[PDB]
Design brief:
Entry title: Synthetic immunogen RH5-34EM bound to monoclonal antibody R5.034
Structural class of chain A: mainly alpha
Oligomer: heterodimer
Chain A: RH5-34EM
Largest interface: A-B, 17 and 17 residues
CATH architecture of the largest domain in chain B: Sandwich
Structural class of chain B: mainly beta
CATH class of the largest domain in chain B: Mainly Beta
Shape of chain A: elongated
CATH superfamily of the largest domain in chain B: Immunoglobulins
PDB class: immune system
Assembly: dimeric
Helix content of chain A: over 70%
Largest sheet of chain A: none
Keywords: Malaria, blood stage, synthetic vaccine immunogen, PfRH5, immune system
């Protein structure tokens, strides 16, 4: 069902968003407590970027497959869902960038 | 301190019921997915269930559907597993686990396990070996519905200990885990490479991934690593 595809996509994006939120919450504790050496700051920036790339890839995959799934179903409201999924992914990508911007500030 | 403590284990008759509980502390329990994973005596890991932050979604191992119920009470920071219609196949140590990142289906915190007595999709090599300071690789062969489309996790289990997450999202290393453990995924197979082998690396290693067809987490059969 197109409505089920939409709901499941929104649920998956909420799950990824909560993963990014818990990641940032734990990162606030990790950066503030660590010995911020030149090697640590270089390594932690890479680790954060690697983690946020995985989250961004996961959200991109959800939006891409939902858009494809809906395009096939219309060959059997829909565009409203397409817009909300695109909107959620866009908002999630802005959130991911903002976590990376703040992490770079706590490390320096 | 991030901790998960299970209780409620015991001996039950076949057809009976038992309720396990898990007390969580050291983290915001209400913001995480939580899970149960079991291990029959002398056997490999087998995932049982997941539950979303507020109970909006539940995932189950097919063989426990209609018998088990996962639930949580965020005020009491507790995860539960109500087990009904018990069978001999359900005898196992049941581990309470945190599922984080939930989008990677990775069990990043494990409890010590509660023992319960009622009285294949992923292929791994049964054994791998090498001398200290050398390297080994452990394959994990799957299909398009699991490894092909979903993030792979790797776990290390030392004798008499709970499993520990090493790798998640196919190749991200858990914070605190040595960078000599590395993961990779190509097509429908995954690999864990361990270089700089130490005597403490002697353990069973398990891969896992979500499977779209089985609608659940699948684990490999495990690999016993021996250090010469």
């Amino acid at each position: 069902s197109y409505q089920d595809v939409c709901r499941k996509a929104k649920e998956k994006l909420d799950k990824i968003e909560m993963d990014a939120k818990n990641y940032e919450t734990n990162l606030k504790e990790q950066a503030n407590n660590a010995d911020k050496t030149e090697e640590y700051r270089k390594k932690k920036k890479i680790a954060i970027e690697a983690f946020l790339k995985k989250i961004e890839e996961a959200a991109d995959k959800v939006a891409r497959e939902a858009k494809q799934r809906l395009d096939e179903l219309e060959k059997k409201e829909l565009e409203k869902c397409k817009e909300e999924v695109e909107k959620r992914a866009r908002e999630l990508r802005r959130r991911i960038r903002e976590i990376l911007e703040r992490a770079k500030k706590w490390l320096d | 301190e991030v901790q998960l403590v299970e209780s409620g284990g015991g001996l039950v008759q076949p057809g009976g019921s038992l309720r396990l509980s898990c007390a969580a502390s050291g983290f915001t329990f209400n913001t995480y997915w939580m899970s149960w994973v079991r291990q029959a005596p002398g056997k490999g890991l087998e995932w049982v269930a997941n539950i979303q932050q507020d109970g909006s979604e539940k995932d189950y191992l097919n063989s426990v559907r209609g018998r088990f119920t996962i639930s949580r009470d965020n005020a009491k920071k507790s995860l539960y597993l109500q087990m009904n219609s018990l069978r001999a196949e359900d005898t196992a140590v049941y581990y309470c686990a945190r599922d984080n990142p939930a989008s990677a289906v990775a069990f990043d915190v494990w409890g010590q396990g509660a023992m319960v007595t009622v009285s294949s999709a992923l292929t791994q090599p049964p054994s791998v070996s090498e001398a200290p300071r050398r390297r080994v690789t452990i394959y994990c062969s799957g299909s398009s519905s699991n490894i092909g489309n979903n993030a792979v996790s790797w776990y290390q289990q030392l004798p008499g200990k709970s499993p520990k997450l090493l790798i998640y999202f196919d190749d991200l290393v858990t914070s605190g885990v040595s960078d000599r453990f590395s993961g990779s995924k190509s097509g429908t197979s995954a690999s864990l490479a361990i270089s700089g082998l130490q005597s403490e690396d002697e353990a069973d290693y398990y891969c896992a991934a979500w499977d779209d067809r089985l609608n659940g987490v699948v684990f490999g059969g495990g690999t016993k690593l021996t250090v010469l």
